[PDB]
Structure formats: C-alpha cells, structure tokens
Amino acid sequence: VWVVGMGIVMSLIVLAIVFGNVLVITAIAKFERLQTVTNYFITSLACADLVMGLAVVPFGAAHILMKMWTFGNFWCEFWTSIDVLCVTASIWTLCVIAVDRYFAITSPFKYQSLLTKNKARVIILMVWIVSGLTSFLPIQMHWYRATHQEAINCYAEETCCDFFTNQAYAIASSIVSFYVPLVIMVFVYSRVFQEAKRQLNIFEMLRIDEGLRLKIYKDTEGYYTIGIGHLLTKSPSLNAAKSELDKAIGRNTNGVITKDEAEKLFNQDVDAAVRGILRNAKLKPVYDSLDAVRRAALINMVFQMGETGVAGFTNSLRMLQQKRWDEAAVNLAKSRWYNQTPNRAKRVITTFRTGTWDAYKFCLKEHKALKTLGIIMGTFTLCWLPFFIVNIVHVIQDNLIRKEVYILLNWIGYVNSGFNPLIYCRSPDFRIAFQELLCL
Template identity: 25%
Template sequence: MAILGNLLVMVAVCWDRQLRKIKTNYFIVSLAFADLLVSVLVMPFGAIELVQDIWIYGEMFCLVRTSLDVLLTTASIFHLCCISLDRYYAICCQPLVYRNKMTPLRIALMLGGCWVIPTFISFLPIMQGWNNIGIIDLIEKRKFNQNSNSTYCVFMVNKPYAITCSVVAFYIPFLLMVLAYYRIYVTAKEHAHQIQMLQRAGASSESRPQSADQHSTHRMRTETKAAKTLCIIMGCFCLCWAPFFVTNIVDPFIDYSVPGQVWTAFLWLGYINSGLNPFLYAFLNKSFRRAFLIILCCDDERYRRPSILGQTVPCSTTTINGSTHVLRKDFLFGRDILARHWTKPVRVDPFSGTLSIRCLTVRKPVLG
C-alpha cells in the first residue's frame, strides 16, 4: 500500500497540469519520493531480518542500510515540516506575502534542505562511526546471535548522537509543525467568523433572513472540519514517531535497557507513517482524488473537471466594517452546497457619490 499510494501521488502530479500549478504539491511529490524509497530500500531488508532472525548482507551493507534509514525517515519528517510552513504562509498571511515568501528559488532551497541536512546526521556520522564512540564493546556483544552463530544488523547510538539526531530529526520539526498548525487553526476560526458575518449581511440585503441556529451550525461545522483535519495530521505524526524518538533519547541514559522487541515495534510504527502520508496529504484532497480516479479508471471522462457553460446570476451589495462588498449566489456544486462569495470593495465615484457596481457572473458547470 505504501508503494502504491506514493507512486499514485507522484504520477498524479506529473500527469495533471493543474496539480503542478500548486506550490505545496512540489513538497508532496518530494515527500512521496522519500516515503517510496523508505518502502523500497529500507523496509524490505528490515522485514527479512525480522523474519529470518539473522542479517545476511554483511557489515558494510548494514551501515548503508542504517544510513539510508536515518536519511530517508528524517527527510520524510522534514517534508512534513515544510508542508506545514507552506500552509502557514498560504493561510495565515496575505496572498502577496505568500507569493514573496514561497518563490520558486525558496521552494527549491527548502526541498534541497530536506535532502541535504539529513545526510549530516545519517551517512556522515554513521559511516565514520561517530555514533559508536564509547559503546563499541556493547554493540559487538549485542550484534552476535548465539542461536545461529551469526550476526544482527545492530544500530546503537551514544548520548551525543542520540540528542543531536533526535533534536534535529524530530523535536525541532515537531515544534515548528505544532506552532504552524496552531496558527492555521486560529486563522481558520477567524475566517469562519468573517464568512458568517458576510453571509448574514448578504441574507439581510436580499431580504432572506436566516436563523441564528443555521449560522452557528455552519460556523461550528467549519471549525470542526479544520480541527479534525489538523488533529488527524498531528495525531498520526505523533503516534508514529514520538515513541521511537522518546525512546531514542532516553535509552542511552538508562544503560541501554530498552528491550530489542520494543525498539523494533517503535521503529516499524515510524515506518507506517510513510504509508499514511499519501492518504493524509493527498487522498484527503479533492483534486488529488479526482486525478487518482482518472488514472485508475483509464482516463474516464466522468471524473474530469467540470466544463464551463454559463449564465449570469444576480448579485447584491452590503457594507461590513466600513467597506462595501458585492455578494452573489454561487452555483450548486454536487447536491446541497450553496456558497456565497464576495469581491474586493467596489468603487465609489468621489465626485457624484454614486456607487459603481460591476456584477460578477458565474457559469454553471456541467460534468462531462
């Protein structure tokens, strides 16, 4: 599932031009590539060792496999952090600020950092043996399998490496993600309140009063949806990786007394995150789901984006916080979604004092 899900994400973005226009999707594709490599280069060898209870690929490949493990899982976490920062700038800042912050060069630098920085806590120290300093005798003792007279691929770390690796690979990204998603949630609540005000004003101007219960229900649904989405993302991330990195930073200070079975369980729990990421960051997105359906259903026309046929619809004006806004009824998309949209403040003639309104038009979509 992890391989299929991540491959679908990559193919969808490469195939769908609209998905390529969204900056966040560059991070999602790179994340999918990292998770795909985890599924192909790391997990199979770990599964073989787990089933056979022996490492048969030699000491050098053990170091390479361990380095790839640290590199790719850290890169995956870094991508999750970058996605949260990208969403923060997109939702919590003005559009101009987002365009200035998330330039193509900055996106390229962030993606490069997601892959380069992990090498300094993976291949460099592991191949140099810096993580083994002071505990080499303990590692040699634990890597020997007395039952089969063979060896395991054992990865143990000293205190300096455990602290450095855990802080860089997990705790700093985790803190940034918590702060970013908290601000996103607060902003979503503010936006829901503003939308409620505009809807009330629009209903009043059209002489179509709505009850307070309806507005409260709409606002509550908006806030609940945002809260659920953020809770799912952060909950899955913490559930998958927190046990491993808490154990990783504690074990050297308690004389490496954590059982090997616990280490294995926590490590594979982290691997599960590589299979969950496509569902959390892509499958929950309508545009991605439509692209997946088209790919899996051999370019079925039923799942293509709606074509444009049209007619104009009425619009009305309202004043909120001293600014005049144009509101218009929007089309029914699906079954029961009736949204209201508004434009920037309209122009007032400073000489005559008359209000100049240019009513916007909406074209009703027809699928197929």
C-alpha cells in the first residue's frame, strides 16, 4: 500500500524534472535575449539536471520500490558514474557562474561577462570533460571498491547496487567534486553580492526610484515625464510635452527616445541636481556634512522635488547636518513628500539613517539577476550538503544513520534537479519565454 503511493510521488518528481529542464533548455535554444554567457552555464546545469531526471532518478526509484537491482552490474557501475558526474558537473558549473559573476561585477562592465560565447562553451566542455574523468575513471577502474566481504558480496551479485566506497575514495571524491567548488562558490559569490551593494551609485539609486520608460508617461504628481524621472513639462497638452522633448533631444522623437538618448538626459539631470545643491546656500553645508552614501540620498530628494522643495525641510536638513540621522528621519517621514511617494521616501530616509545601500538591497534589475543565481547556488547546498555531511561523517563511523537516512538525503539532493526551473520563473526574460512555449 506504501509502494503504490511512493511510486506516484517519484513518478511526478521525474516528470517535474524532465519537463522543467526541457522548458529551460528549449527557451535558451530558441529565444534570442536568453542566449547569454550566464544562461549558457544555466543550460549546462539544466542539462545535468535533465540527465539526472532521465538516467539517474528513474533507475534510482526502481532500485527502491523493488528493493533490488534488475539492470545488471554493468549498468550499476555506469548508473552510479552518470549520477556522480551530474552531481560533480552541477556544483562545478555553479562555482564557474560564481567566479564569472565575480569577474563581471569587479570589471568596468559591472553586469557583463568578460568571456565570449566561444570561451563559455569551452569552459562548459572542460567542466563536463574533466568532471567525467573524476567520476567515470575512479568507478570503471574500481578505485571506489571497498575491501569488506559485505561489499564484495554486493560487487559479485547482480541484484545489488548499494554504492559501497572505501575510506579513501569517499573522502577524496567528496572533497574535489562537492566540497572544493562549494567553499570557493560561496566565498566568491558572497563577494559578488558584496561588490554589487558597495558599487551602488546615485545613477542606479535613481534608476531604482524613478524607473525607466522610453515614452512620455504621467508622473506620480501628474506631469509629462520620460526616461528616468525627467519632467518634460507640467503642461496638460501632449503637443506641449512632445515640443520640449524634440528640443531637449534635438531630433524628431514623436514621443519616443532610445536608451542612449534617455541616459544622456539622465546624466544631465543628475549633474544639474548636484549643481542645484552647490548653488543653494541651505543645502550646500548639509552636502558637505553628509558622507558619499548620504550625499546620494540628498541628491535623490533634490532630483525629485527640487533645490527649493528640499530647502523647505528646514528642521530635517538641520538634524542631518548635526549627524542626528534618526532625529532627522522622524521629521523627514512626517512630510507631504513621504505621504506622496511612501515607497521611495522609505528608501531615501533609510539610506539617510543607515548611511548604507541597505534600502536598495537587490532592487536594480541586474541585482535581482544576482539574487536569482544566488538562490540556485544556495538551494543546491540546502539539498546536497546534508547528504554530503552524512556521507563524509559515515566514513569516520559507519553505524549511526545507515541506509534508510542516506537514501532520503540523496533524494533531497535528487529533488534539487527539478527546483532550478521553478527559480528561473523569477527572471522576467525566462517568465516571458516559458509562457510563450506553454501557450499562456
């Protein structure tokens, strides 16, 4: 009665992995904006998950429901070699993304991989070539085979596939395959998050707060706006809005501008917002008393409301000068500014309180992409690390958790092959790709 119910759970686990990882590979193989260096490595781990969901998870489920091996000692040594290669290739791929992301975030390109799509393929090929050698050669050469009679009675028998390891293999293949890339991946991807938050500037802070639209839209207050919070005019005539745009750009825009055109406007509004402070005798001494992070928070207020508007905060600016952040915070929040834009004022005042980009944490579109790659890496660890800890622990002492726990923790690790396609649903580029393939 247990077996029937157990099989149906595993049958759905298999299909969830296969159809999930098919949809991921299918999207990158067809969609143009999805063909990127970082999404090429994502194809390498979705591949490992599909090979896992087709050649590993189905054979593993059978070995449990029938409690025996009905596929011979050849497919037993090949099945385990594929499994080990999938697990080794997945973390090394994640550690490669982690490293690639460190080099992309430190480089002046900030969110662009330095490797070309030709180098990226070689990196994936060298991952699958080398990880296939550390997985298939110590298994087909039988460097994994243990010396105890209980293990050799399972090595001679065709109805057994309990992967028995000697004390040496069990420690080496756990260290090189999982522990070494995990230590590097986490240490290096703690730095990709660290470098993104520290290199956050006023231009990203305002792209977060004012957004980006390349066509004239109505502001929060109700005046014609374009690009990144660039007020075209307060006039309620579209002809009076499309006139100011054609003059500010210097071409027949017809109510639409480019990313380059909008960026040129935004670099001019930010420079004027800084200028507007240095010319205003009220804001200028407060601009001196504020640090690099809090200076961007004042520029953020002057950019939105204006040099005159912000000078109106006579009590706040004073408490900001005296380094009394929290005393300024309460006064800045009991403002009509806070009530008009609560979401943005919550972020501006927190940056004033903390003096850190703690308010703009994973807010930029490029940063939610780092959080996504950060969840895939972290979730992997949540699934595989309990199996590996118990794996490396039972090399020291054999007799504690035995077979019943080892298989469960292995299946926590197996279920991780089907979770990555559900975490790609966070990315709008994949969200749009998935709904197109599934016809929704």
